[PDB]
Amino acid sequence: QYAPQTQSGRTSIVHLFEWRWVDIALECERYLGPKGFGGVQVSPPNENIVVTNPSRPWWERYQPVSYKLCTRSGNENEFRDMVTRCNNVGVRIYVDAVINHMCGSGAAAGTGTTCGSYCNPGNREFPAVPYSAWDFNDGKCKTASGGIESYNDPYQVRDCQLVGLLDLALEKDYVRSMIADYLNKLIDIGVAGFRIDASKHMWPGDIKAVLDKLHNLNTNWFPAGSRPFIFQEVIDLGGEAIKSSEYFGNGRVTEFKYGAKLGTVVRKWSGEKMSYLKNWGEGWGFMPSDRALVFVDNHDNQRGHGAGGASILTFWDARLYKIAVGFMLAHPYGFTRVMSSYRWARNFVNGEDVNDWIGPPNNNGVIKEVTINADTTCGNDWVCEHRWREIRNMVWFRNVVDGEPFANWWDNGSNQVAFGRGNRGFIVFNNDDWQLSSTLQTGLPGGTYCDVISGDKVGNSCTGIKVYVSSDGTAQFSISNSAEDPFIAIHAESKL
Numbered sequence: 121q122y123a124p125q126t127q128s129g130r131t132s133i134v135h136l137f138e139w140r141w142v143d144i145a146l147e148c149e150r151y152l153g154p155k156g157f158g159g160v161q162v163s164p165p166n167e168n169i170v171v172t173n174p175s176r177p178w179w180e181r182y183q184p185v186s187y188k189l190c191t192r193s194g195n196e197n198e199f200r201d202m203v204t205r206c207n208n209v210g211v212r213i214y215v216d217a218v219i220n221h222m223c224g225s226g227a228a229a230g231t232g233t234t235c236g237s238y239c240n241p242g243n244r245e246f247p248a249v250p251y252s253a254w255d256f257n258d259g260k261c262k263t264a265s266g267g268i269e270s271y272n273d274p275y276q277v278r279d280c281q282l283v284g285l286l287d288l289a290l291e292k293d294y295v296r297s298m299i300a301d302y303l304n305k306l307i308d309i310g311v312a313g314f315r316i317d318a319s320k321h322m323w324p325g326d327i328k329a330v331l332d333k334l335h336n337l338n339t340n341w342f343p344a345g346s347r348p349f350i351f352q353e354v355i356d357l358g359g360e361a362i363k364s365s366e367y368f369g370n371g372r373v374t375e376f377k378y379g380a381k382l383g384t385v386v387r388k389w390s391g392e393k394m395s396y397l398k399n400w401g402e403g404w405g406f407m408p409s410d411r412a413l414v415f416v417d418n419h420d421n422q423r424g425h426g427a428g429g430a431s432i433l434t435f436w437d438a439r440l441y442k443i444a445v446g447f448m449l450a451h452p453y454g455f456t457r458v459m460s461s462y463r464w465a466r467n468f469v470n471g472e473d474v475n476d477w478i479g480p481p482n483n484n485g486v487i488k489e490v491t492i493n494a495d496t497t498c499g500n501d502w503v504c505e506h507r508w509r510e511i512r513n514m515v516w517f518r519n520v521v522d523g524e525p526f527a528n529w530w531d532n533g534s535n536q537v538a539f540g541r542g543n544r545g546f547i548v549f550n551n552d553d554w555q556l557s558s559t560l561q562t563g564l565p566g567g568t569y570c571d572v573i574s575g576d577k578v579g580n581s582c583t584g585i586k587v588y589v590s591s592d593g594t595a596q597f598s599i600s601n602s603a604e605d606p607f608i609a610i611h612a613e614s615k616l
C-alpha cells in the first residue's frame with residue numbers, strides 16, 4: 121500500500137490533468153519513458169454526468185454516473201492501450217478513484233452523460249451500476265440541509281453530501297463489492313495504484329474493507345505478490361476533527377501542509393525564511409516520511425482557494441514555482457508528485473477567481489490534443505510543467521541521489537540555502553535580493569560538473585554553467601538575485 125511499485129530507480133509521478141489517453145500513451149513513449157519519470161496519475165476514467173452550466177467544467181469528472189471506462193479522455197480500448205504502452209516503457213499508471221459519491225443530487229434525469237447511460241439523481245437511480253435509493257446515506261446524515269454544515273463533526277463530513285453530491289453507503293457490502301470490482305478491473309488491465317479521492321469524507325474502515333477485496337498487481341509487469349500503491353486524499357492543515365493519521369493503516373496520505381508551508385517560505389510571507397528549512401520534513405510537524413505523498417500544488421488548490429489558499433505556488437508564478445519544485449525534488453522527504461496543467465482565463469473579483477470552473481482546451485467539447493513544439497514545449501494551451509528543463513532535470517536529480525542522506529547544509533542566515541544528498545548531488549538556492557558568493561563543501565568528487573538547471577550535459581560539454589569542485593570537495597558558487605533561475609544543481613551523472 122505504501123510502495124509506489126515504480127520500475128526500479130524512478131522516484132516521481134506526474135499528474136497529466138485532463139489529458140486524453142492517446143496523448144498520455146504517446147507521452148510515455150517519446151518523453152516520460154526516456155526522461156526517467158516513474159508514473160502518471162490520470163483523471164477519473166469512469167463515466168460522469170455532462171455539466172453544460174457552466175460549459176463542461178473540469179469538475180464534472182468528479183460526478184460519476186457509472187463505472188464504464190468512457191469519458192472525454194477516451195474509451196476502454198484507448199485506456200487499455202495507454203496502460204499497456206506506458207508499462208512497456210517503464211512508466212506506471214495511477215488512477216483517480218472517485219468512490220465516495222455519484223453525481224449531484226440536483227442534476228436532471230436523462231442521458232446527459234459521457235457515454236449515454238441513463239440516471240435519475242433525484243430518485244437515486246443509476247441503472248448502469250446499478251444503484252438504488254438504499255445505496256446512499258440520505259437517512260444516515262442528521263443535518264437539516266443534508267450537506268456538511270460543520271467540519272468539527274466527523275459524522276456529517278463522512279455521512280453527508282459533499283457539495284450536494286450523492287453520498288455512497290460505503291458500509292454495505294453491495295457498494296463495497298461494486299467498487300472493488302471496478303478497481304480490480306483496473307488492476308487486471310495493468311494499473312499500479314490509486315488516488316482515493318475525498319478519503320476524508322469516508323470512514324477509514326470502509327476504505328479498508330474495499331482495499332481488502334483487491335487483487336494483486338498484474339504479473340506481466342509487476343513482481344509476484346505485489347500490492348497496489350494507495351494514496352488517500354485527506355486535507356488536514358490542523359485544527360479539525362479528522363486527522364491524516366486516522367488513514368495511515370490503509371496507505372499513504374496527501375501531505376497538504378507541505379505545499380502550504382513551502383509556498384509561504386518561498387513567497388517570504390509571515391516572517392518565514394529559507395534558512396528555516398534546515399529541519400524541513402517531520403521537524404516541521406508533518407506526517408512520517410514513509411506515509412506521505414508530497415507536492416507543491418494540485419489540480420484543486422492551484423486554481424482557487426483549496427488547501428493552502430493564496431500561499432500556493434503555481435505555473436503562474438514560474439520563477440518561484442521552479443525554486444519550490446526544485447527544493448521538493450532535492451529533499452528526501454516523502455514520495456513526490458509533479459503537476460502538469462492547462463492555462464485558463466482568470467478573472468479575479470474580490471481576490472477570488474470566478475473562472476476557476478474552466479475546463480481543458482477543447483473544440484466544441486472535445487479535448488484538444490497535445491502538440492509538441494520544436495523546443496519541446498506544448499501547444500493548445502497545455503503548459504507542460506513536466507517538460508520545463510528545470511523540473512525535468514530535477515526529476516533526474518532525484519533518481520540519481522535516491523537513498524542518499526541529507527548532508528552539508530548551509531545558509532547565510534536569511535534566504536540563501538544549500539545542501540547535498542550524500543556524495544551524489546548538491547543544490548544551492550538564492551532567494552535573497554542580493555548576490556550569493558560562497559565556497560561550500562559539496563561532498564562530491566572533484567571535477568567539472570554541468571549545472572542541470574541552466575542547461576544539460578551533452579557529450580563531453582555543458583550547455584549551461586559549469587561548476588568546478590576541487591579535490592577537497594569545495595566549490596565556489598555565484599548566483600545573482602536577478603538570474604532567471606536563482607539556483608544551481610549538479611550531480612554524479614552531470615559530471616564531465
Ligand SMILES: O=[N+]([O-])c1ccc(O)cc1
Nearest residue numbers: 179180182183224283420
Ligand atoms: O471536486 N470539486 O472541487 C468539485 C466537484 C463537484 C462540484 O460541483 C464542485 C466542485
Ligand SMILES: [Ca+2]
Nearest residue numbers: 278279287321
Ligand atoms: Ca461520505
Ligand SMILES: [Cl-]
Nearest residue numbers: 315353374418
Ligand atoms: Cl490530491
